Design a protein around this ligand. Structure first.
Ligand SMILES: [Cu+2]
Ligand SMILES: [Fe+2]
Length: 174
């Protein structure tokens, strides 16, 4: 059977879910329980964590502009997602997506991670650049598995404390 239902008009679906593509929800997964995890991410949203995904992430910035803060070759770099851009991020490249614009919309496609293949989430020192804290997670569901991880980082000066220079990372807003 068509487990995932019939085709349907995507711009209309994005319009209809506009209330969810802004704070505090910010994103909406299109189909549930599929191998391909297909999400539309709105804005505005800024964040300070970097994602270490053990699989690739595809992006197609449909509306508005965004950008990814990256580590590439041990160096801080930015990949702009201008409206209309597509991009494929290889495994493990660290990214912290920034989505400044309201009414923006990006198609993001990932794969379910198999048992034993973990995601990392991590934060780096604004002053010296050293890794501050990393947590590895078996990501089964974004909505229950991820916000407590971030919240536990923001609530602890210990987790936020740079082991190189001792500066305490700011937590939620940079
Ligand atoms: Cu990611
Ligand atoms: Fe530091």
């Amino acid at each position: 059977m068509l487990t995932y239902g019939a085709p349907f008009n995507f711009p209309r679906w994005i319009d209809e879910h506009a209330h969810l593509l802004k704070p505090p929800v910010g994103n909406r997964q299109v189909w549930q329980d599929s191998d391909f995890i297909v999400t539309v991410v709105g804005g505005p949203n800024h964040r300070t964590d970097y994602h270490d995904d053990p699989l690739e992430e595809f992006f197609y910035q449909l509306r508005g502009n965004a950008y990814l803060n990256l580590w590439v070759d041990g160096r801080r770099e930015r990949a702009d997602l201008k409206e209309g851009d597509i991009f494929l991020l290889p495994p493990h490249v660290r990214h912290s997506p920034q989505r400044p614009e309201a009414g923006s919309a990006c198609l993001v496609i990932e794969r379910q991670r198999p048992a034993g293949m973990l995601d990392g989430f991590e934060w780096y020192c604004d002053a010296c650049g050293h890794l501050v804290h990393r947590v590895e997670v078996q990501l089964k569901s974004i909505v229950t598995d991820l916000p407590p991880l971030f919240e536990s980082f923001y609530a602890s000066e210990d987790k936020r404390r740079c082991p190189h220079c001792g500066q305490v990372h700011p937590g939620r807003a940079a």
